[PDB]
């Protein structure tokens, strides 16, 4: 059959280093790409086709416990050992990451139907707002 | 409240690039995740904590129609621009992406609940093998 529309989800993908080297493309993001699994949703009518391809990586997996201290390796962004320690002030999810890094960890709390989570690292503070779906 | 179960999609992300450069994170992973945007689905029971996350990024919209040729800017690769062409071998959707890369193009068809995808790029080829959802 000809048809090909509906939602596609990579399952398998053989040789994307090879096909991504013909392409010049450089090993920082050859190094990335070979971890992504892409969605493609495609509608065709006749002869007209509009695809839309979505790359993605399930990532950092976190179970904890508030007040119990865990190992964590952020294996997701600088790689690093921290002792984290979540603790509740308010209605407000508070982390302690303590390693290398001075002033680290993140604050999270919610507030209508929007999650906000500020990360702060140093002197740099990285605000995030997320929508309940 | 302190329930913050759900699952929460990212609309919002301020100031990401100084919070991972001050994780030393090179500049080129930087550069990707900028681009990012995160879904997190948190699993809360009391104050145990499952949460996962799951960055992706919309990319390459591809319109075209099978005989028409049409002019492609690979954004999400190599950044070339190539002029397409697509037709109907069989039931198999062969496409010729003429630039500077010699042989390249990709061959696209369905084998059961499957979609199959070929990508040639001079003597490297890449399978790639999705599932209808």
Redesign the interface.
Known sequence: ????N???????????E?????????F??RK?AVRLT?T?VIDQDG?????????????????????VEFDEY?K???N?HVKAL?T?EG?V?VCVQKGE?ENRGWK?W?EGDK?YLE?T?????????????
Chains 1, 2 share one sequence.
């Open positions: 059959t000809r048809d090909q509906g939602t596609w989800e990579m399952e398998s993908n053989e040789n994307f090879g096909y991504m080297k013909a392409l010049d493309i450089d920082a993001t990335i892409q493609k002869d007209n086709f509009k695809t839309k391809t979505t790359s993605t990586f399930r990532n950092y997996d976190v179970d904890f416990t508030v007040g952020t997701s962004l600088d690093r979540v509740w209605d999810l890094k999270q919610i999650l990360l690292c140093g002197d740099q503070v990285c605000r995030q707002v997320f929508k309940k779906k």
